Structures are given as structure tokens and as C-alpha cells.
Structure 1
């Protein structure tokens, strides 16, 4: 059961990472003050990968 759990979480995380990374390109270097672009960083947490 534990193995299966870990597996499904891994799959879900990968799918969502991919979806968000694809979405990121929906932004076109907005200009706000010294801010030149906005982005979302998605990364699995090694503390959780362990």
C-alpha cells in the first residue's frame, strides 16, 4: 500500500509540474518598476522526495 501511495503521489506531482511549466509561458515580460518579468517556480521538495 505504501509503495502504491508513493507512486501515485509521484505521478500526480509530475503531471502538475508539467502543466504549470507549460502555463508559465503565458507571460510576456511585464514592466513594473524594476520588475521586468514574473514567473512561477514549481519544484518537488527534496525533504519530501526522501
Structure 2
């Protein structure tokens, strides 16, 4: 059960990262003042990865 829980957490994290990366493509090259692009950076915290 613990192994399954870990695997499902990993799978959900991967899916959400993929979805956010997909969404990010639409905000490429937005010209606002000196701002030229916007990104939602998603990462896995080490304190929780371990």
C-alpha cells in the first residue's frame, strides 16, 4: 500500500507538471513594459521528494 501511494503521488505530480507546461506555452512572448514572458515554475520540494 505504501509503494502504491508513492507511485500515485509521483504519477499525479508528473501529470500536473505536464499540464502546467502545456498551459505555459500560451503566455510566451507577451510584451509588457520590459516584461517579455511569463512562466509558472513547478518543482518538487526536496523535503518532500526524499
- State the TM-score, normalized to the length of structure 2: 0.81
- Shift in Å at residue 45 of structure 1? 1.4
Moved over 6 A (4+): none
Equivalences, count = 50
Q: Which protein, 1 or 2, shows the higher relative CO under an 8 Å CA cutoff with sep ≥ 6?
A: 1
Name the structure where helix makes up a greater proportion of residues: 2
Segments of structure 2 that go 5 or more residues without pairing to the other structure are none
Residues 3-49 of structure 1, C-alpha deviations (whole Å, 9 max, x = no match): 11111000000011011111110113222222221111111112111
Tell me, what secondary structure is at the counterpart of 1:43? Answer: coil
- State the TM-score, normalized to the length of structure 1: 0.81
Tell me, what secondary structure is at the counterpart of 2:14? Answer: helix
CA-based RMSD:
1.2
